[PDB]
């Protein structure tokens, strides 16, 4: 039973959540749900990044105060993430008392430890700098400790060779942010308090739970808890250099690892407003469900930093072929005979213990795939099993055994076997498709657990069910694109 704290980058409170942002939150959510399925203590945390010029600029545009805007933005963001079933344990804000206190604490410790330097610059003004260069050797060692992604470890080497420089962490009024203690008119640069927002969001969660020990257990220097940050390749510098150094210099633990992902493209190109491929998360949900996108992204994700392409044409074909025709089909083609011919009761023995064992034996490799973030590999393995299950059903041909008087026992054995194979597949896909999983659990009259597959459902009553998942079509994609054009 590990203790894990997982975060997603904090979205700026200056715009709506789009499909690009969703790649990150969905990737993290699938991993998080799998970790919870394996029994670990997981804390999935996020928050809105509500300070700085990005927010100040937007607030000005629509003539509204930052506090009012960030409030509305926070609500809109959370509604969208909830719509995609991103299971955060806490979604907070960088503009909070928790973040202010922790930002002041870390700043005070850095200054006291001699890592803060002061210098004037050009109109003139005194600024405060973080002495990142004094952490080079430690960062080098940490970088080479076999944790980071190869592509990331290599990118950092380029940065180390270019030489680390002191970082300007102060900004002058007027600025929407936290005031620097003992420095009138000076504010902390947004990127200084933003990552501290991870800590602020966790402190908020601990305080809400009335938990007075967890914060220190997770952030103290010799913590045995694991800390992971899911981020895009454009903010790796802040998370791999500035951030770990800020923590080191203030007596806090550094990240256990950074999980970096690439960018989402649509139809092979960067999202385009004029073409209707710049799609907002809220707009997507008006046309499709969350599971469809979660599945598509997951099928293409890996442990590398490669870009992920949402080919709209391929989207419809893949969702129907895999979810509808392979997985769900396994249940619908066997459930009829069971509910009508056997009052929903499954057979008392496995018709083919061998085949079932093949399915449960795959748990090791599939679980390792979810764990290592090789999502594409996990999906390929799962669909390979689905093909196997559907082939079994074809060979046994229940529709033939159905019209053969006196073969009821054989029929129930065949169809129950298929439903049990479906049970295993839905368990492996549970981290990916939260809603379909709930519908499957209602049908099976069972909660799906990772170890539960070792015990197939025998002499078990299943419920009748309406379509678990309907096919989607290109007309819906056309509507989505047209709607997206109209919003621009
Ligand atoms: N088009 C995109 N594809 C994937 N991630 C994105 C995209 N645009 C922004 N992000 C991610 O959103 C996070 C900020 O909310 C960053 O980690 C960033 O990399
Ligand atoms: C603490 S992660 C902050 C990420 C930043 N808001 C970005 O949108 O890039």
Curated annotation (Swiss-Prot):
The protein's Enzyme Commission number: 6.1.1.10
Function statement: Is required not only for elongation of protein synthesis but also for the initiation of all mRNA translation through initiator tRNA(fMet) aminoacylation.
Name of the protein this chain belongs to: Methionine--tRNA ligase
Catalysed reactions listed for this entry: tRNA(Met) + L-methionine + ATP = L-methionyl-tRNA(Met) + AMP + diphosphate
Residue interval(s) of motif 'HIGH' region: 11-21
Similarity remark: Belongs to the class-I aminoacyl-tRNA synthetase family. MetG type 1 subfamily.
Keywords assigned: Aminoacyl-tRNA synthetase, ATP-binding, Cytoplasm, Ligase, Metal-binding, Nucleotide-binding, Protein biosynthesis, RNA-binding, tRNA-binding, Zinc
Sequence motif 'KMSKS' region, residues: 270-274
Subunit: Homodimer.
Domain of life: Bacteria
């Amino acid at each position: 039973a590990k203790k894990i704290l997982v975060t997603c980058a904090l979205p700026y409170a200056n715009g709506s959540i789009h499909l690009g942002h969703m790649l990150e939150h969905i990737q993290a959510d699938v991993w998080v749900r799998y970790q919870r399925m394996r029994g670990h203590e997981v804390n999935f945390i996020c928050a809105d990044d509500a300070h700085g010029t990005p927010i100040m600029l937007k607030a000005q545009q629509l003539g509204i105060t930052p506090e009012q805007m960030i409030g509305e933005m926070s609500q809109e963001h959370q509604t969208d993430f909830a719509g995609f079933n991103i299971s955060y344990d806490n979604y907070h804000s960088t503009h909070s008392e928790e973040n202010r206190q922790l930002s002041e604490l870390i700043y005070s410790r850095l200054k006291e430890n001699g890592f803060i330097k002061n210098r004037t610059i050009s109109r003139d003004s005194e600024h405060f700098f973080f002495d990142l260069p004094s952490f080079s050797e430690m960062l080098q060692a940490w970088t080479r400790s076999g944790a980071l992604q190869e592509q990331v470890a290599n990118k950092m080497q380029e940065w180390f060779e270019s030489g680390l420089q002191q970082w300007d962490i102060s900004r002058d009024a007027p600025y929407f942010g936290f005031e620097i203690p003992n420095a009138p008119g000076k504010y902390f640069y947004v990127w200084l308090d933003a990552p501290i927002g991870y800590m602020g969001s966790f402190k908020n969660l601990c305080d809400k739970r009335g938990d007075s020990v967890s914060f220190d257990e997770y952030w103290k220097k010799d913590s045995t808890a694991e800390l992971y940050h899911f981020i895009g390749k454009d903010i790796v510098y802040f998370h791999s250099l500035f951030w770990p150094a800020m923590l080191e210099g203030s007596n806090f633990r550094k990240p256990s690892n950074l999980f970096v992902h690439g960018y989402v493209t649509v139809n092979g190109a960067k999202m385009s407003k004029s073409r209707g491929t710049f799609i907002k998360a809220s707009t997507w949900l008006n046309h499709f469900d969350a599971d469809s996108l979660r599945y598509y992204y997951t099928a293409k994700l890996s442990s590398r930093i490669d870009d992920i392409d949402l080919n709209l044409e391929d989207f419809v074909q893949r969702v129907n072929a895999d979810i509808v025709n392979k997985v769900v089909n396994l249940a619908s083609r066997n459930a009829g005979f069971i509910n009508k011919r056997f009052d929903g009761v499954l057979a008392s023995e496995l018709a083919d213990p061998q085949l079932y064992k093949t399915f449960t034996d795959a748990a090791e490799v599939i679980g390792e795939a979810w764990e290592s973030r090789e999502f594409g590999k996990a999906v390929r393995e799962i669909m390979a099993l689905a093909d196997l299950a559907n082939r079994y059903v074809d060979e046994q041909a229940p529709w033939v055994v159905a019209k053969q008087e006196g073969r009821d026992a054989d029929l129930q054995a065949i169809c129950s076997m298929g439903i049990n194979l479906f049970r295993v597949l839905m368990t492996y896909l549970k981290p990916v498709l939260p809603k379909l999983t709930e519908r499957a659990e209602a049908f099976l009259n069972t909660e799906l657990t990772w170890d539960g597959i070792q015990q197939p459902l025998l002499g078990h009553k299943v419920n009748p069910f309406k379509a678990l998942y309907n096919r989607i079509d290109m007309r819906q994609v056309e509507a989505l694109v047209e709607a997206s054009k109209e919003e621009v």
